[PDB]
With several copies, the nearest count.
Chain A
Amino acid sequence: DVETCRDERCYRLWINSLGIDSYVNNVFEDVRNGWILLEVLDKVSPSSVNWKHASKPPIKMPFRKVENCNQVIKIGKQLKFSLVNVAGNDIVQGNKKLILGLLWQLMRFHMLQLLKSLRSEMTDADILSWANRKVRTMGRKLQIESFKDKSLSSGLFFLNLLWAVEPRVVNWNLVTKGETDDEKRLNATYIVSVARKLGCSVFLLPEDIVEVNQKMILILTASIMYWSLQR
């Protein structure tokens, strides 16, 4: 049941970096009136939400809460997500199992869509290719086979990629080896701050790099790419 606490942090940080107008202090609580989830849906799938049938908080009337959550479920099923034996009132009641399931699929959906936009039709693979190729231009040979690659935990790859993008934002005297859990933790926190220094609006936690959360890895990299292609 400790995974519930980790997912709570993960999706909370992700939602707060999407450019949403609401701020999440606790995903399990702040998501119950359905508004935030509608916002995330509108961001990950533009124009998907019909705001004419939604109610903006604060909300006292329970009807307005159930209505928001039902649109959330509808759009979710329309996107081919997997929601069985649930409805809007499940979100209002705080069904954590459903909330985490809906959030995961939202995160995965956004990631795939981002990759797909790189096509011609972006894909996760195009992002993986860009990162490896970008590092090779600096003369370095370290590469990754995927965004799940275990070696990522060291943080060395990201720092090299960031250095490749803009060498002026990475001070190597400050970087450590990715060996001890402490050393990794240190680079991770450094990576997250340097990326934001470049313009990356990411919300993963330092431990998302140390534990190699592939979904969060994909988005960070894609975000680095985003700003690199505009330099």
Chain B
Amino acid sequence: DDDIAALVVDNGSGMCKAGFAGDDAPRAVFPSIVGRPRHQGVMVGMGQKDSYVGDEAQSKRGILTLKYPIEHGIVTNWDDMEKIWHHTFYNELRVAPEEHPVLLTEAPLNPKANREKMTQIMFETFNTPAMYVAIQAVLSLYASGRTTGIVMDSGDGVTHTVPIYEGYALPHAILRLDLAGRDLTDYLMKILTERGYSFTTTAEREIVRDIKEKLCYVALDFEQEMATAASSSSLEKSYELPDGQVITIGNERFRCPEALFQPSFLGMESCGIHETTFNSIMKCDVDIRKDLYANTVLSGGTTMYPGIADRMQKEITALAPSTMKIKIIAPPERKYSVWIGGSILASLSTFQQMWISKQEYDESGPSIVHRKCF
């Protein structure tokens, strides 16, 4: 009853939501973006604060470099993530870390050393009684309608294809792709600046994030779509700068998400997203594959593009044996699921035998996260 209850901290690329287990909604939802000065900053009406988080970083976006700390779901900057967490406990929930277990969430396919560094920080730096790290899509499921399937999760810092048999992820067939939402905001700004555009001031580096999310589209046939950019009329749309100025975007809108399917566009040797779902499926048990094609679920902010369900279907239908029923699932809410699934989970008496305790961390070190969190 309140003072004592785990704190669920959901660490998103754009947004963080933090609260208390047993609660219906997040008590603190805030901007992550996380913005570090990239020039020793600090106003003298603030501490030497070099990670601004949420909206106090929107209003210096122009003078700051913004990570979504977290980027494609993965943490790229560890002391500015440390800042965010300190602010979660000490300023947003007004809590003491050494009295509450924390459930932190993490990206599908989150790198090894990341899982260990967040075990590390949480225990040594915040002196946490206990902790657990759950993948975000799995708490979306517990909070809801399926048990066997493969999810394709695309956040800000990573993408993974995860085959799940009966609520259990199959770690050998999990595949990680380091190309997600940040890679696509970045590539949009370069193709827009290549057209002689100018995203020169901090806030406006975050203004490509809104064009990307507002005008991008996934093409069914990139090829016949590019000449259905040259038969223009209806493809260019405009975006307005804060500055008063105008942007016009045309072939760029669909050419941005296409780097997901063809990462050669980005200069990467990687297979695209359609091949990676297919190569996890081939790594699984011969007798669940038919289940994994019938239940391909997409989740994450980078799966929100118009056309991605159809184009994922079209493409898996080409690689798949000539008979598979292929059912791509793309639930329209693909906003608080990850946080209320963790709030449920960390409130069950079930869960207290599921944490990694201070004792265990000493016993093992940071490695233990790999053992206990699957």
Check: B250 CB closer than 8 A to any chain A CB: no
Number of interface residues of B (CB under 8 A): 37
Q: A62-B145, A124-B3 are in contact. Are A82 and B46 (CB under 8 A)?
A: no
Q: Which residues of A75-90 are within 8 A (CB) of B? A: 77, 80-89
Stretch of B90-98, B179-187, B364-372 with 4 or more beta carbons under 8 angstroms from chain A:
B90-98
Check: B56 CB closer than 8 A to any chain A CB: yes
- A85 B56 Cβ-Cβ under 8 A: yes
Residues of B contacting A101 with CB < 8 Å? Answer: 91-92
Check: B45 CB closer than 8 A to any chain A CB: yes
Check: B2 CB closer than 8 A to any chain A CB: yes
Residues of A contacting B57 with CB < 8 Å? Answer: 85
- A85 B91 Cβ-Cβ under 8 A: no
Interface centre among B43, B45, B54, B167, by most chain A C-beta atoms within 10 angstroms, is: B45
> Which single member of A62, A83, A85, A149 contacts B144 (CB below 8 Å)?
A62
- B2 A146 Cβ-Cβ under 8 A: yes
- A104 B56 Cβ-Cβ under 8 A: no
Residue of B nearest to A218 (CB): B3
- B90 A80 Cβ-Cβ under 8 A: yes
CA distance A81 to B254 in the complex (A): 45
Residue of B nearest to A69 (CB): B45
- A85 B52 Cβ-Cβ under 8 A: yes
- B94 A84 Cβ-Cβ under 8 A: no
- A85 B166 Cβ-Cβ under 8 A: no
Check: B363 CB closer than 8 A to any chain A CB: no
- A148 B2 Cβ-Cβ under 8 A: yes
Residue of A nearest to B30 (CB): A84
Residues of B contacting A105 with CB < 8 Å? Answer: 91, 94
> Which single member of B2, B45, B47, B91 contacts A88 (CB below 8 Å)?
B45
- A83 B91 Cβ-Cβ under 8 A: yes
Instruction: Annotate A136-151 by CB proximity to B: 1 below 8 A, 0 otherwise.
Output: 0000000001111100
- B1 A84 Cβ-Cβ under 8 A: no
- B91 A84 Cβ-Cβ under 8 A: yes
Residues of B contacting A63 with CB < 8 Å? Answer: 142-143, 344-345
- B54 A85 Cβ-Cβ under 8 A: yes
Check: A189 CB closer than 8 A to any chain B CB: no
Q: Which residues of B156-184 are within 8 A (CB) of A? A: 166-167
Closest Cβ of chain B to A215, distance in Å, is 9
Closest Cβ of chain A to B57, distance in Å, is 7
> Which single member of A62, A86, A149, A214 contacts B46 (CB below 8 Å)?
A86
Q: A63-B142, A124-B3, A145-B1 are in contact. Are A84 and B56 (CB under 8 A)?
A: yes
Residue of B nearest to A73 (CB): B45
Instruction: Annotate A46-80 by CB proximity to B: 1 below 8 A, 0 otherwise.
Output: 00000011000000011100000010010001001
Q: A82-B87, A104-B94 are in contact. Are A87 and B43 (CB under 8 A)?
A: yes
Closest Cβ of chain B to A104, distance in Å, is 6
Check: B49 CB closer than 8 A to any chain A CB: yes
Residues of B contacting A145 with CB < 8 Å? Answer: 1
Residues of A contacting B88 with CB < 8 Å? Answer: 82
- A214 B2 Cβ-Cβ under 8 A: yes
Check: B334 CB closer than 8 A to any chain A CB: no
Check: A6 CB closer than 8 A to any chain B CB: no
Residues of B contacting A133 with CB < 8 Å? Answer: none
Instruction: Annotate B85-113 by CB proximity to A: 1 below 8 A, 0 otherwise.
Output: 01111111110000000000000000000
- A149 B92 Cβ-Cβ under 8 A: no
Check: B147 CB closer than 8 A to any chain A CB: yes
- B94 A81 Cβ-Cβ under 8 A: yes
Residues of A contacting B3 with CB < 8 Å? Answer: 124, 146
- B94 A82 Cβ-Cβ under 8 A: yes
Leading 9 A-B pairs by shortest Cβ distance: A82-B91, A85-B56, A146-B1, A87-B45, A105-B94, A82-B90, A148-B1, A108-B94, A82-B87
> What are 25 sample pairs from A and B whose C-beta atoms fall under 8 A apart?
A61-B143, A61-B344, A63-B345, A70-B45, A73-B45, A77-B47, A81-B90, A81-B91, A82-B87, A82-B90, A82-B92, A83-B91, A84-B49, A84-B52, A84-B87, A85-B55, A87-B43, A87-B166, A105-B91, A105-B94, A109-B94, A146-B1, A147-B1, A148-B2, A214-B2
